[PDB]
Each structure stands twice: as C-alpha cells, then as structure tokens.
Amino acid sequence: EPLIELFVKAGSDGESIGNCPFSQRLFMILWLKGVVFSVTTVDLKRLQNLAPGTHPPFITFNSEVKTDVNKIEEFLEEVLCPPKYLKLSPKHPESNTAGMDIFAKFSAYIKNSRPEANEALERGLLKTLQKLDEYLNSPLPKFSTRKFLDGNEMTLADCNLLPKLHIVKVVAKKYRNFDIPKEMTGIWRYLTNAYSRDEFTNTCPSDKEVEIAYSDVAKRLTK
Template sequence: KVITINPAKPPPEFKAIGLKHVPAILHEEEGYDAVDDIMQYIDKKFPGGGLEYSSPEADLATKDFFSKFCFYIKAVNQDPTKLDQALKNLNGFLESALYSNGIANGMTDHQNENEIPDNPYEFLVSSQLTHLDCEVLPKLQHLRVAAKELKDYDIPMHLRGFWRYLHAGYTNPVFVQTCPCDQEIILHWHDRPETPKLSHKKHSVIAKRSQSFHIMFQSMLLL
C-alpha cells in the first residue's frame, strides 16, 4: 500500500513510528526512511526481486542531473546550461548501445544523432526496473513538472534516449501507481524557501484542481 504525505506536515502516525523523511517504508513493524536502508531491507526481505544492479557507468551518468536541477530551480538562477549538460550526459548514456551485461562502455555526446543506435534496454541497465530506476525516474518527473511550472523550462525534445526512458516509466504500472500527481510536485517545490513563487490565484487554482499527471509525448518519441 502506497500512502502520500506532505513532508512539511507529516501525520502523527508517521512521526509516531520514528520516520522523518520520504520516501519511507514500514513493513512488519520495521520502518526505514533512508534510501540505502530501504534498498538493503527490500533486498534482504525479498531476495530474488531483480532490483539489484552493478553499473558504475550508470551511476556516473545519473549522479549530476538532480543537483543541477535543485540549483536551477532557485529563483535567483536563470541559466539552465549546467542542467542541460547533465541531461545531455544522461541522454548519451541512454542512447549508447555499447552495453555488456547492463554496463555501458561509452558515451555518445559527440556522435551524429542519426548514427546513434538505440539502447537495447527499456530502463537504465536492464529490461526491468532496478534500484537505480526507482531513484532516478521520480527525480526526472519532479524535474520535468516543477521546472516547467516554476521556471518555464522544457526538457529538449531532441534527447531521444531521455524521452524513451521516461516513456518506459510512464508505461510501467509500478511507477504509475507510485508517482505523485503534478499538483503535489509543484506545490512541494513552490513551498521551498528559495524557489520562484506562483501568484496567490494560480497557487489556489493548482491546489484545488483535480489530480493530473504530466505524461504527454510527441508521437516522434514513441517511434
């Protein structure tokens, strides 16, 4: 069972079991709210789930984009150059076909886009979700929704690998069922102290409208 909460105002039952951060897991009276602890517990409690992975290259390709987003989303920063580069690096990894047992051996930033073969995997290092995807996909969704609403930033449409990867997430029931709605993402980032602020009217409209999910694609991305 997945329960969404407001981290700024967690319900009493959340705090009563000693949890302070999200995401968190509660299972058989054991609770964890650190990502590494959650992953270790799942691997130990449910062995053979297929979430394990080993890919230093994937770790490297995904390590910068969220920190660049967190810096860019601040109200004082109007330059998306570093975020663009981090997304370009991730896209290069996703478009690379130089895989061996789920490990990429090179980036493709300087190749002609028309000559880049497709990643043979749906996800980062496998045809199924791994721990890394469970961490990266939600962050990409936060980036896509919040950056558009608060900074009018659009992820470049020519990043084919990126969009195909995000589409794989949108068509996976695990991600769809656990993905927060647009409103939760927007208001979460809006309420942070250094981010751009919506007008009172727009904030009220977003808070009151029915839940929606930003999963639109251009047809070219699905080819």
C-alpha cells in the first residue's frame, strides 16, 4: 500500500550495489515485511535537495525522507505491523547482542599493520566468533538446529548481523586469508541457511565490491 523508496549506497559502478551492511539491512527488512518498494543507488560524487550529512541508507516513506537506519528500522517495524504485516522484532533480546562484538574486532584485526599485534587480534576475533557460535548451538527457551538467531524465522536480528558477518567473511579471507573455523558449526549452519535465502543473497553486494571497499582500509603486516 504505502509508497516506499530505498536509497542505498552505490559501488564502483556508481550505478550498482556498493558495500554497506546498513543499506542491506533495510533492504532485508523491507523484503521480509512483504511491502512493495523501489531501490535507488547513490554515488557520493553526484535525492535532490537534502540536509547536510545525510548519506545512504535512507528511505522515502510517502514522499517523506526518513534518515538514520536505526530510526528507519524502528519506524518500519512500527508502521508495517499486524494484522496486515508480521512483526520482525526478535522474541529473545539476547538475539540482538549475539555476535555484536565481531564486526569491531574484525575491523581492528584488518586495519592493523604491526606483525606482533596480529596474533592477539586474530585470537580476539576467533573469541567473538566463538561466543556467537555458542549462542547458535545453545537451545532457546544437544545442539540447537534452528535456522536463525531467534528461532526458525528471520528477524530484525538477522538483518543486522548477516550483512556484517558477510563483510567479515569476505574481507578477512581476502586480506588475511582468514577462515571462520569449521569447528564453529553453529556459524556455518546459520550462514548456509542464510545463503540459501533470496532475502540475504539477492541483497549482498558482490565479493569484488565488498573487497574493493576495503582496499584502502585493510593493511598488510609490515615490520
């Protein structure tokens, strides 16, 4: 019913889906809600007439611009509610903090250039992945076989985490030849399920685009 326009960040193409876990998050939320909406990319070096600082992702709801992904998310979950739509908010608040420290540890591990500091950072990263993995294997009120963070349905929690885990996996691999340990079966089951879902797969920018976005960010380890 409502008129929704999503404005995400553009990649190198300047006309394609660039790297941004936040744009992809909203994209996933909109998709899961079921509502109709359009998607428009935005090249930094280039809708018309906006406030200073407003950068993707942002949407237009009935011609009105909405800013701040977190504000947007709240808004959406609010207006796109029952009986017409399904609530996407997780039932367990802990589903919201699961793996929340991964992206930050990955950023430090990837931006570092000191060889002697790399070992501890990789250990720090594995540590955050370990906690997430344990959240995924621990049953919610043997090894849990549920498909996502909050149960067997995707929730706002997966929209927030999956895009980030994806960046983590692709970049860590490219710039550190790092692999999420297969011993972490929870993470892998979770990711497998996610990559088999169109809402996640069709909203992921390309590996190239994801890697490019970090070419000037990740550093080699130099003495």
